[PDB]
Amino acid sequence: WEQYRDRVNMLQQERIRDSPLLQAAKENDLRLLKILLLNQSCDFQQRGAVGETALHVAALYDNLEAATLLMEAAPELAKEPALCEPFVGQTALHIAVMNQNLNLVRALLARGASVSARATGAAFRRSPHNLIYYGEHPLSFAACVGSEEIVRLLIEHGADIRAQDSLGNTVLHILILQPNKTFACQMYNLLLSYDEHQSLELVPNHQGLTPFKLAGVEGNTVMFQHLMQKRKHVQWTCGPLTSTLYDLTEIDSWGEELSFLELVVSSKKREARQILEQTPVKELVSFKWKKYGRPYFCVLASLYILYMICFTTCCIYRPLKLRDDNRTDPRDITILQQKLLQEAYVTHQDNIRLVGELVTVTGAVIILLLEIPDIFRVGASRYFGQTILGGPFHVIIITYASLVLLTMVMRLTNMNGEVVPLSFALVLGWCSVMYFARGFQMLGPFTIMIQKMIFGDLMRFCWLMAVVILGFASAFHITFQTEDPNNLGEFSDYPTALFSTFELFLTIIDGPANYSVDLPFMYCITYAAFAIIATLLMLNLFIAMMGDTHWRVAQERDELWRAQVVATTVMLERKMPRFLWPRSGICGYEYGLGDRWFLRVENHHD
Amino acid sequence: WEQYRDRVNMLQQERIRDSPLLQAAKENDLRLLKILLLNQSCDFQQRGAVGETALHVAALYDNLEAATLLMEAAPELAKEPALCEPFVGQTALHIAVMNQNLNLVRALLARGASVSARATGAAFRRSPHNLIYYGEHPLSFAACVGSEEIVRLLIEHGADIRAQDSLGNTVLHILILQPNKTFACQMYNLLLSYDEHQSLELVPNHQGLTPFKLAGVEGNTVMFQHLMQKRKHVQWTCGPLTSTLYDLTEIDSWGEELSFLELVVSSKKREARQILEQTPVKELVSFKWKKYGRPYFCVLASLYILYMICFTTCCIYRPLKLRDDNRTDPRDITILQQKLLQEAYVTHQDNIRLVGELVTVTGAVIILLLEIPDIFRVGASRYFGQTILGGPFHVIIITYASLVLLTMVMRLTNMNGEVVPLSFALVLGWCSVMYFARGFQMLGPFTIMIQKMIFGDLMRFCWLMAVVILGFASAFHITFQTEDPNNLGEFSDYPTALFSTFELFLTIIDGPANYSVDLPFMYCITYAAFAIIATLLMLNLFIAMMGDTHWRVAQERDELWRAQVVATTVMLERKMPRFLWPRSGICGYEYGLGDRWFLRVENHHD
Ligand SMILES: CCCCCCCC(=O)OC[C@H](COP(=O)(O)O[C@@H]1[C@H](O)[C@H](O)[C@@H](OP(=O)(O)O)[C@H](OP(=O)(O)O)[C@H]1O)OC(=O)CCCCCCC
Numbered sequence A, B: 001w002e003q004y005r006d007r008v009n010m011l012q013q014e015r016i017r018d019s020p021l022l023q024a025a026k027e028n029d030l031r032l033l034k035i036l037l038l039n040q041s042c043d044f045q046q047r048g049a050v051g052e053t054a055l056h057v058a059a060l061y062d063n064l065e066a067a068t069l070l071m072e073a074a075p076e077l078a079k080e081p082a083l084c085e086p087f088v089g090q091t092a093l094h095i096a097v098m099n100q101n102l103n104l105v106r107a108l109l110a111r112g113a114s115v116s117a118r119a120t121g122a123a124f125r126r127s128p129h130n131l132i133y134y135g136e137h138p139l140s141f142a143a144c145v146g147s148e149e150i151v152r153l154l155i156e157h158g159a160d161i162r163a164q165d166s167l168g169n170t171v172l173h174i175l176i177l178q179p180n181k182t183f184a185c186q187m188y189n190l191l192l193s194y195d196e197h198q199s200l201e202l203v204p205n206h207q208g209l210t211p212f213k214l215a216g217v218e219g220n221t222v223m224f225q226h227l228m229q230k231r232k233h234v235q236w237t238c239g240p241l242t243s244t245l246y247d248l249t250e251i252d253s254w255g256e257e258l259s260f261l262e263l264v265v266s267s268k269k270r271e272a273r274q275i276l277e278q279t280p281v282k283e284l285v286s287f288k289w290k291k292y293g294r295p296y297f298c299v300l301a302s303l304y305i306l307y308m309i310c311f312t313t314c315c316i317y318r319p320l321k322l323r324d325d326n327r328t329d330p331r332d333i334t335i336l337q338q339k340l341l342q343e344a345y346v347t348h349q350d351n352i353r354l355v356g357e358l359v360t361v362t363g364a365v366i367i368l369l370l371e372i373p374d375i376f377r378v379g380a381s382r383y384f385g386q387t388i389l390g391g392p393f394h395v396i397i398i399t400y401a402s403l404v405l406l407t408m409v410m411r412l413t414n415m416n417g418e419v420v421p422l423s424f425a426l427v428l429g430w431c432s433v434m435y436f437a438r439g440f441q442m443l444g445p446f447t448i449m450i451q452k453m454i455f456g457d458l459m460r461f462c463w464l465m466a467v468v469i470l471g472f473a474s475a476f477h478i479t480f481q482t483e484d485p486n487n488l489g490e491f492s493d494y495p496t497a498l499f500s501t502f503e504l505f506l507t508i509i510d511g512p513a514n515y516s517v518d519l520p521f522m523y524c525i526t527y528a529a530f531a532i533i534a535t536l537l538m539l540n541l542f543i544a545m546m547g548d549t550h551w552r553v554a555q556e557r558d559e560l561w562r563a564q565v566v567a568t569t570v571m572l573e574r575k576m577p578r579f580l581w582p583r584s585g586i587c588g589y590e591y592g593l594g595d596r597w598f599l600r601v602e603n604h605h606d
């Protein structure tokens, strides 16, 4: 983090500056660095603050000839790495490779500079603190700085390609993680050119990711297209139109528990959505969704709608009886109460409601059995945090099933107050039907807009709206504390004044007006101020920024709908039985092609 | 001002045109101006309307050879400036320098033309009347016209760099104040090149502003970057990423009472906000806000929210007793009144309200002690006029504390009518919580939008809305003056007709409708006209221009939020004790660097 790196950098510059050997290595004096090196008592193993030698200083400031004098004074400076924590394995070869001083790389490799050196300090890790991630080996350093000849020269002296770091990343992984993609595709070609073969391309990191899977996850569409140039075979071309066969082994991921498409659609990187726009992935999901995914999602949508209708019908016809106790209160409004369990089921219609309630609790147990192990199979925050996988819809469906089982416990144990979980369950259950809106293009991104207004716009403006409601509700309550509550009951106590001011903010109830009595004038002053600031200004401000939130989602409508039908497709292929979801693509074994599955794409060009 | 300048210009052209010597100097006649100059009785000291000589006329119309004949006729014309008020010190050298006639500059400097001449007329001051501001000395004139060789020639003949004018501005100040910056940066380089040294760069004007501070205040981002090229030192570069150390002495402004960042953020010039986008300022405020400013602002926000909760709770539980006098009026609605001070505190809950009220008045005194001297330390209009410093929020918090102290005066002196300052104090206090919305990016510019709709849109449309309310309220009142007020009480008297028409404009109450009686038909005609013009047309017009006001603020959202967290950071560093705010940046004294503080920035490039 920042102050530790700053302390390390000024200490390193101080130990360069005070030491005359390191200063002469820094500023490249040929008047100096010959009198000092002719002393046999002079310490050529003098280290800086981070344990770096004078050769590290000469490689850092691009002093080639000073590094040659430091090398001929003592040849062991190439073997020595730095020692302190942010640079705990860095050699002078790493600095010469990053600086791309190629004659210095030849001068170091003429000496005994190790090519298998691991620069495993904290300044070389993949972190948000570090501005780059190049790896720990000099070969990955030379691949990431983009110099071809240093890569070939490291190949000429050792430096095997298959080197895995602390993250398990091969040089192909780190080259995929670089921001410049077209500048690194040529390096990916030349690094694959020295492959002698478990292949180099198929070895994973510590996250289990293949370079194909890492190119899919990180949004590297250029590298994905480059990797699918070598996985495709043009069957024929004829005039404008050509038929080509894409290998579907790395994309479909049949035997894998965590598939490639599931890895891409549930990735934190946003640009992985443009991975879904690339061709064999696009026709693969189009075949999976049109052939199987849309009818299965439609019959699940209709079955859930019928289950909601059964739940709603057993909610309307719930057992209620006239209350035995008397009212004796003009404010009291309840004329009937809940029925006891011993008298709830005495008739035929109550038995019809019983089989409806049994269907309801069976469906809630089915929901819990379907959605509880998929919380545990992935990250618990990752399951609910995803806007594409239906995470908010997942937590709504989970708490709906929990409220239905709580209602069953309340019914079996004769607990009064069954209105509460039944009302929450009705609202959350019928709002759960919007999960199936993602199966259609016409109302798919509408729920994405609704989600981006719930947690996008409402969570920020709710604080300003809340403090306006608190101030005007407090003023409205204390200006009516001295008045008769029969003539104007909107602000009689503090919770009903809070609720009335919330409804007057949203303009869903009328302004309180009794023209048969004369109200306080401070009601008129504070309500004119409230109607100016809250109903007129802040409400339409919230409406306008909801509008441009809707505009921002509507610009990316097709990509977001494509991503959520991908998440729906991989969810349905993962959850449903294997006989209902046959393996996608051309089988290939009967055509002489060996145990590989393919997708044929015919496209029209010039 | 305009007519005086016009009268001066036509008088000057008249005195040129009537005088044959000045006419021959104007239109460059070599047939003339040899017969006239051979007369020994001819007055070569003949002056125009502004006291300008014939050499001023020859320098004004770029007549070089006419100026040579005027100089060899009488060499003292270079020593004479003009005399009347808009040009009370202007010489012919100033006109020759502005015209960039360099041979005329050599011809004047061959004679005894003073280079320390001050053209201190009203046409050379920094005013909105004058279209340019070049200064009073010819060296600043040559710097601001951008001619390099005239600057070098003036250096060859006197003309010291460190010349301060009536505004105290050095040539560096005036060169910063020029609108075209990149062509003036090389002139700044040349003017710093003849510095022999209190330095030239550190001398202030009469406002106390350094050229660094003036470049920050005026929004000169190009000159700010040029001034920070000489205040930075690259520690190292390595491949794509470099670490460089910025001097933080001129930016942090430790011992100064009016700091650099406070000068930039409270400046009237708008482009100074882009000064906040430049690099060491940006990481300095990012370090100050993330390390210290955001937690201190968050604990102050939570403490103010708890103080509002205590004030609101002692507002709800205020002492009220049943009224002794009888009602005897069907319109009368008050059933209880304020309690006397002798009986207000008799119970334990009244003592809890007493310690809450003591906390409330202590907080109001604390607010007044914190915000009254900062009105006086700056401009009184400047404190409240700033949208970034929280000036409207400052006057709301000031009047909230004033209303709380007025409420304490009413409580101690048993004054009836305590609803009024308590209701205003509740509204203004809970609206003061939006001051702390600027500490978060997600709801920071929302209050800027609210302010730009209060004083931007509402103050212009309130007049049109007001005259519509007056006309329709007057018509609604006089069409119901003849009717029974029991059947329709919305327009019974003129203030309630005004309030009803305001609420019907905002559509927060229903249209008045009694279907048990037959209303006047002019109520239906005027309400149809009102519903067309006011509820439908002008209200949605106000909503639409509120929407594009919101759009205009949302385009500059990050810059406005950055400016207001800068104002928050400099407010918190100025107000809070020094032990809670340590000095920002690297100390530097332990690294051998002499008594200067630095900020290290590491950045990634090609
Ligand atoms: C009762 C239901 C509970 C639901 C539980 C689940 C609630 C939940 O998980 O929502 C998280 C929500 C959005 O989730 P998510 O991480 O997927 O959204 C990302 C990010 O939040 C951006 O704001 C999005 O907009 P933009 O492109 O940058 O403009 C962008 O969407 P997209 O570009 O990829 O489409 C995404 O990068 O994040 C919040 O906004 C903070 C509010 C916290 C949520 C409030 C938690 C109470």
Ligand SMILES: CCCCCCCC(=O)OC[C@H](COP(=O)(O)O[C@@H]1[C@H](O)[C@H](O)[C@@H](OP(=O)(O)O)[C@H](OP(=O)(O)O)[C@H]1O)OC(=O)CCCCCCC
Binding pocket: B270, B384, B385, B386, B387, B388, B391, B392, B395, B396, B455, B456, B459, B560
């Ligand atoms: C009760 C609370 C009292 C509050 C007391 C304090 C009230 C108060 O001081 O507001 C002043 C207000 C805005 O102040 P301020 O000078 O900072 O705003 C500038 C200017 O007014 C422009 O209109 C702004 O918009 P734009 O960019 O050109 O489009 C621009 O904002 P920004 O670009 O910098 O962001 C600024 O250059 O000026 C008025 O609009 C006239 C209404 C007079 C105010 C009405 C006075 C009653």
